[PDB]
Every structure is written in C-alpha cells, then in structure tokens.
Structure 1
Amino acid sequence: LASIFVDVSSVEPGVQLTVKFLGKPIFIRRRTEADIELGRSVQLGQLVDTNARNANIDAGAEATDQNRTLDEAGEWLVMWGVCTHLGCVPIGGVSGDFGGWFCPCHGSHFDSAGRIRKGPAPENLPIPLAKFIDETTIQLG
C-alpha cells in the first residue's frame, strides 16, 4: 500500500522534517509557541484563501489554525512542500513576511500555518492524509 510511516520522536520545537512521498516533499514542522500563537492570531477575513485545503477533514472546512494542524495543541503542521502557484519548494525556517515559508520562484509568502498571504499562489499549502498512530509516528496516506 502507498502509506508511509514517519518517526517524529526526535523532532524538536522549531524543527522541520522533510520527507519524500508520492515523489514530492512533505513538510512536517513541529511548531514553536511563537508559530502557534501567531497562526491563531489571524482572522479568517485576513486570509487570501479561507479553505483549509486539508485531506483529513471536510473539504469545506475553514482555514483556522486549528484546521491546519494534526493535533489540538497545534504543534504538528504537516503539509505538501509544493507551492500552489507553479510547484516550487517553499523555503522555511520562518522565512518571508508572514513568519512561515517563502517561495522564491515568484515570491509567494505563506504564514506559520502554511496559509497563502502574499504573491501569486492561489491556495494554502495542501495538507495530506496524515495522522498519528501512536506517540511517535505519523502515517502519511
């Protein structure tokens, strides 16, 4: 079966793990308290794309910070590392003007929940089928 199983036991706050799945990067960021608070401080009305783009929940779900992470605590942000404009790999480590990712191909800025805030990309970075299957492992797909 296609599903893969990622050990995240050693991922510390402020670290992104990048894993290849279906030929493309998946970003698994363990968010800092700053990342989480900032994500939760954004009103839906401020967003370019109000859809959660999240395979795990209703396709009409709103792009609240809570609908962008795997866990209620908001520590685990898992998304395709594929810019929704033309597919370049967004640069992380708190890059760009919105405390998240910057796609250097045509200048798209994503926030700390991977939501599009500035530039040509039309959509928030999509979230794959992903869930914890115990304390230390995320199943993708």
Structure 2
Amino acid sequence: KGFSYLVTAVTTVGVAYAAKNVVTQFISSMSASADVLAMAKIEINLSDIPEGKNMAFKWRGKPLFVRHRTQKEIEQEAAVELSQLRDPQHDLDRVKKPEWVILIGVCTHLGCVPIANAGDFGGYYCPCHGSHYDASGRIRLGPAPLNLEVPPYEFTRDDMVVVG
C-alpha cells in the first residue's frame, strides 16, 4: 500500500507545481503594463500664482495642488489643538516655506477631488461624501481617515519648485 500511495503523492506534487505556474502568470497578465509605469518630475513657476490662489496641475495622472497662503491663514492654522485631530500633525511638519503648501489633490476616503475655499474651515470640501479639510490639508470633519498627502519637493528658485 505504501509504494502504490507514494506514486500518487509524487504525481500530485508535480501537478501542483505546474498549476501554480500557469495560474500565476495568467494573473500577472492583468497588472500594469510596461508602458504605463512612467514616473517623471514636474516643475512649477511660482510667480504666476497670486496670493490666496489654489492652482491644480496634472501629475502622474492626478491633481497636484499648489496653494499660496495669506498671513492670517498662516496664523490661524498654527493655533489648532493637535489633541482634537484624528491624524495629529503640526503645520510646520507639513510645509517647507510657510506661505506655500503643496498637496496631492485626492480625497483619502474614496478618491474624489476636494473643492478649494469651501467647507467650514476655509480649506477644502469634498462633495462626494462630505469631508472637510483645513488650509494645511488636515482632515477636520467627515468620513475620511487621513490628511491630504504631501509629495517630495524642493525649491530650485525663489520662483521655481520641483516636485518629484
């Protein structure tokens, strides 16, 4: 009995190997193709952005906000109590220069684009299910779990910034 069952065991082992390989390559057919995965950088000229203006740029398929904040906004964003936040963070943890803030304009709940200068908090409002953000991009009301994402950047001129 042992010998006859050993044969079956070995056969099954080989069949399992072949099946794994076939199924997995079929599955990897549906992942991103080798012409979709480009990742470029983007350069923004800041002297075309007035004070109080939120500009949106297309980057890697999604909006990129650049906001030129006024002085009272810089002041009132610092007053916030970090204990009353679901994703606590200070403003200076989120900007390199106080009068500029750069964000990825995608809502952290289910992906809609927040409208600027709307909501209860002077920041952004998302119409899809009702989440409010402040001018630091911090989540203040509604179902979203996280703050708006900050990309890597650096200033190459006092009027030029590169996001990459």
Q: Using structure 1 for the length normalisation, give the TM-score.
A: 0.85
* Greater RCO, CA 8 A, separation 6+: 1
Separation in structure 1 between the aligned mates of residue 55 and residue 142 of structure 2, nearest angstrom: 25
Q: Do the aligned partners of 1:84 and 1:124 also contact (CA within 8 Å) in 2?
A: yes
Q: Specify the SS of the correspondent of 1:122.
A: coil
Q: Specify the SS of the correspondent of 2:74.
A: helix
Structure 2 residue aligned with 1:138: 161
Structure 2, unaligned stretches of length 5 or more? 1-38
Separation in structure 1 between the aligned mates of residue 131 and residue 49 of structure 2, nearest angstrom: 26
Structure 1, unaligned stretches of length 5 or more? 51-62
Structure 2 residue aligned with 1:76: 100
Structure 2 residue aligned with 1:47: 85
Q: Do the aligned partners of 1:70 and 1:78 also contact (CA within 8 Å) in 2?
A: no
- The amino acid that maps onto 1:99 is G
Which protein has the larger Cα radius of gyration, Structure 1 or Structure 2? 2
Judging by fraction of residues, say which structure has more helix.
2
Q: Shift of residue 41 of structure 1?
A: 0.9
Query: Does residue 1:12 correspond to 2:50, yes or no?
Result: yes
Separation in structure 1 between the aligned mates of residue 63 and residue 70 of structure 2, nearest angstrom: 21
Q: Specify the SS of the correspondent of 1:35.
A: helix
Structure 2 residue aligned with 1:123: 146
Q: Specify the SS of the correspondent of 2:47.
A: coil
Structure 1's consecutive aligned runs of 4 or more residues displaced over 4 angstroms after TM superposition are none
Separation in structure 2 between the aligned mates of residue 35 and residue 26 of structure 1, nearest angstrom: 20
Separation in structure 1 between the aligned mates of residue 73 and residue 123 of structure 2, nearest angstrom: 8
Q: Shift of residue 10 of structure 1?
A: 2.0
Judging by fraction of residues, say which structure has more strand.
1
Q: Specify the SS of the correspondent of 1:128.
A: coil
Give the count of matched residue pairs: 126
Identity of aligned residues (%): 48
Q: Do the aligned partners of 1:89 and 1:103 also contact (CA within 8 Å) in 2?
A: yes
Separation in structure 2 between the aligned mates of residue 18 and residue 35 of structure 1, nearest angstrom: 19
